[PDB]
């Protein structure tokens, strides 16, 4: 039948020489290895400008996955935005000014809202203090922020640096209050977890949850409970009275800082759909909201975008289509999106030929508590598929090693690593035997530093080099590559032409 060419992706599996918190060394991986051993690699830059990043700036998993299925060097909005703020562009962006000509004409509020660090993966705080400036420029009184507290792309417990250096710029600019905080896990969720995300609508605009006069306190109090940047309850700052310090009313604007669409669609539906049933909103729900979106987020959403998207076209998932081939995607909930919409170059609709496969992960609040998550029904799912030679392509994530990895904890990351690996090999043994290839690879890094030098948690990703292993003898692959040239090397395995839209290069000498 079909010789499938599965296109493997260990999410957040890096290389790195320190082995000291090093999660992806110490697993014990024999099949890896001997694939490693026995068949042609290299490694490929995930990192800055090799993936269309700032320079400097660590890989996650929309970039990656852009990159990976896109055959090029895809410009990223991090970079874009940076660079609108640097040429003084950005405070000339159409949308901002509506948004503050909005508040203004009718008198109501602009509410800012987003991640509050400088992890650069769904936002920067940079980018809130070139919001603040505009805002003062534009003559804005009534500006209020509701803050998203990190501790994933940055320190675990780095919140009051970034709360201390807004409350700076504040008084620098001239405007803008905290109104509230709230943990990513409540405001940022993206599995559809509403209990979460409910618990944050419900803070910003009943002014409902831990309430503190000084947000110094709020942070210093919920860590005196154990409770950290990423899992802080939405919380709200009140006045001397007593009284919140703003919530979100009718005909406010809000304008959301993130640039990444996966966390952001969402808290986002809750705020503008007209008819939202996944939770009740209640009566005062604030209605003829002016929303802005920094990006494209999805058209569900009844907004507002800053910077306008911009189609990919041919890529590795539109050429297989073009050619008549019949394609499928899998991968649990935490990465499911990736597989999809981010392989696709931000498109969420199905290519004529596509398949998708979703599989649950655990119902559990951290995957450190069962770190082969869903692995196994991904695999045994995808085993009974090949079995049935249906697929020309494959593109399958494991998200063990990032999801674990996260954690900041050792032990789970290696029991992860582990899992990830039985099914690895389990997967590429039964390609092998089609007389299929497989093409593993990663992402970003992450499970290979889960520690800092001094031994404390190490939540974020890293910037070290991924792997690349093509299993077919007989071949080199160069060396000095970057993600964009996986999708011309597996246009290479299966003889299909290259596009001359992917700038990239087939691996295979
Ligand atoms: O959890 C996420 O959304 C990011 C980190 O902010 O991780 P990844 O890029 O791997 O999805
Ligand atoms: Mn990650």
Redesign the pocket.
Same mark, same amino acid.
């Given at each position: 039948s079909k010789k499938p060419v599965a296109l493997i992706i260990l *999410? @957040?599996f890096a290389l790195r020489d320190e082995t000291y918190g090093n999660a992806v060394a110490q697993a014990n991986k024999p099949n890896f290895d001997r694939y490693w051993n026995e068949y042609p690699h290299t490694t490929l830059k995930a990192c800055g400008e090799a993936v269309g990043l700032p320079e400097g700036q660590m890989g #996650?998993?929309?970039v990656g996955h852009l990159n990976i299925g896109a055959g090029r060097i895809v410009y990223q909005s991090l970079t874009r935005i940076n660079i609108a703020i640097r040429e003084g562009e950005f405070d000339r962006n159409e949308t901002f000014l509506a948004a503050m000509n909005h508040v203004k004409q009718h008198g109501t509020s602009l509410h800012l809202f987003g991640l509050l660090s400088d @992890?650069g993966? +769904?936002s920067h705080i940079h980018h809130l203090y070139a919001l603040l400036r505009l805002a003062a420029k534009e003559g804005v009184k009534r500006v209020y922020i509701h803050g998203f507290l990190d501790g $994933? *792309?940055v320190g675990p417990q780095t919140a009051p640096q970034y709360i201390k250096e807004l409350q700076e710029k504040i008084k620098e600019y001239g405007v803008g209050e905290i109104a509230t905080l709230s943990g990513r896990y409540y405001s940022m969720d %993206?599995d559809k977890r509403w209990d979460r995300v409910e618990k944050a609508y419900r803070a910003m605009v009943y002014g409902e949850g831990p309430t503190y006069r000084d947000p110094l306190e709020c942070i210093e109090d919920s860590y005196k409970h154990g409770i950290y940047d990423e899992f802080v309850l939405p919380s709200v700052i009140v006045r001397e009275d007593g009284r919140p310090v703003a919530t979100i009313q009718d005909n406010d604007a809000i304008i959301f800082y993130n640039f $990444?669409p /996966? %966390?952001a669609i969402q808290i986002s539906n809750t705020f503008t759909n007209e008819d939202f049933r996944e939770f009740d909103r209640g009566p005062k729900h604030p209605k003829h909201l002016f929303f802005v979106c920094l990006t494209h987020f999805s058209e569900t959403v009844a907004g507002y975008v800053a910077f306008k998207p911009t189609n990919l076209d041919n890529t590795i998932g539109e050429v297989l289509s073009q050619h008549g081939l019949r394609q499928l995607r899998i991968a649990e909930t935490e990465?499911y999106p +990736?597989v999809t919409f981010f392989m696709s170059g931000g498109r969420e609709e199905e290519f004529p030929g596509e398949d998708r496969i979703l599989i649950n992960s655990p119902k559990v609040p951290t995957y450190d508590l069962k770190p082969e998550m869903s692995a196994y029904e991904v695999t045994d799912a995808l085993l009974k598929e090949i079995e049935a030679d249906k697929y020309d392509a494959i593109i399958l994530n494991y998200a063990n090693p /990032?999801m674990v990895g996260?954690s900041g904890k050792l032990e789970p990351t290696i029991k992860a690593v582990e899992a990830v690996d039985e099914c690895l090999g389990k997967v590429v043994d039964a390609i092998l035997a089609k007389g299929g290839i497989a093409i593993i690879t990663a992402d +970003?890094g #992450?499970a290979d530093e889960v520690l800092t030098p001094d031994g404390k948690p190490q939540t974020a +990703?890293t910037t070290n080099p991924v792997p690349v292993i093509v299993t077919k003898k007989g071949i080199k692959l160069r060396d000095g590559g970057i993600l964009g040239d996986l999708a011309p090397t597996m246009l290479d395995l299966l003889g299909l032409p290259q596009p001359k839209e992917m700038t990239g290069k087939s691996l295979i000498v």
């Amino acid at each position: 039948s079909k010789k499938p060419v599965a296109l493997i992706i260990l *999410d @957040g599996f890096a290389l790195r020489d320190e082995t000291y918190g090093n999660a992806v060394a110490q697993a014990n991986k024999p099949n890896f290895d001997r694939y490693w051993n026995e068949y042609p690699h290299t490694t490929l830059k995930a990192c800055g400008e090799a993936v269309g990043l700032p320079e400097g700036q660590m890989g #996650n998993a929309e970039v990656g996955h852009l990159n990976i299925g896109a055959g090029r060097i895809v410009y990223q909005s991090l970079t874009r935005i940076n660079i609108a703020i640097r040429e003084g562009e950005f405070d000339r962006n159409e949308t901002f000014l509506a948004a503050m000509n909005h508040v203004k004409q009718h008198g109501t509020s602009l509410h800012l809202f987003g991640l509050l660090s400088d @992890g650069g993966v +769904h936002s920067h705080i940079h980018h809130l203090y070139a919001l603040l400036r505009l805002a003062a420029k534009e003559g804005v009184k009534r500006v209020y922020i509701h803050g998203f507290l990190d501790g $994933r *792309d940055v320190g675990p417990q780095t919140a009051p640096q970034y709360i201390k250096e807004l409350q700076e710029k504040i008084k620098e600019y001239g405007v803008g209050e905290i109104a509230t905080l709230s943990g990513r896990y409540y405001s940022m969720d %993206r599995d559809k977890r509403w209990d979460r995300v409910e618990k944050a609508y419900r803070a910003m605009v009943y002014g409902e949850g831990p309430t503190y006069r000084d947000p110094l306190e709020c942070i210093e109090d919920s860590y005196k409970h154990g409770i950290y940047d990423e899992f802080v309850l939405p919380s709200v700052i009140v006045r001397e009275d007593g009284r919140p310090v703003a919530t979100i009313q009718d005909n406010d604007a809000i304008i959301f800082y993130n640039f $990444r669409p /996966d %966390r952001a669609i969402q808290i986002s539906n809750t705020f503008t759909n007209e008819d939202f049933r996944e939770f009740d909103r209640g009566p005062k729900h604030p209605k003829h909201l002016f929303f802005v979106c920094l990006t494209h987020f999805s058209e569900t959403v009844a907004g507002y975008v800053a910077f306008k998207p911009t189609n990919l076209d041919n890529t590795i998932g539109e050429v297989l289509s073009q050619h008549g081939l019949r394609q499928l995607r899998i991968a649990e909930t935490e990465k499911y999106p +990736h597989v999809t919409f981010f392989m696709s170059g931000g498109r969420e609709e199905e290519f004529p030929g596509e398949d998708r496969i979703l599989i649950n992960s655990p119902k559990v609040p951290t995957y450190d508590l069962k770190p082969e998550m869903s692995a196994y029904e991904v695999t045994d799912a995808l085993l009974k598929e090949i079995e049935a030679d249906k697929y020309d392509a494959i593109i399958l994530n494991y998200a063990n090693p /990032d999801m674990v990895g996260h954690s900041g904890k050792l032990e789970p990351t290696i029991k992860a690593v582990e899992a990830v690996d039985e099914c690895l090999g389990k997967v590429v043994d039964a390609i092998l035997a089609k007389g299929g290839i497989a093409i593993i690879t990663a992402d +970003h890094g #992450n499970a290979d530093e889960v520690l800092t030098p001094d031994g404390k948690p190490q939540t974020a +990703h890293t910037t070290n080099p991924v792997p690349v292993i093509v299993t077919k003898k007989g071949i080199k692959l160069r060396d000095g590559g970057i993600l964009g040239d996986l999708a011309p090397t597996m246009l290479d395995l299966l003889g299909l032409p290259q596009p001359k839209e992917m700038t990239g290069k087939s691996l295979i000498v």
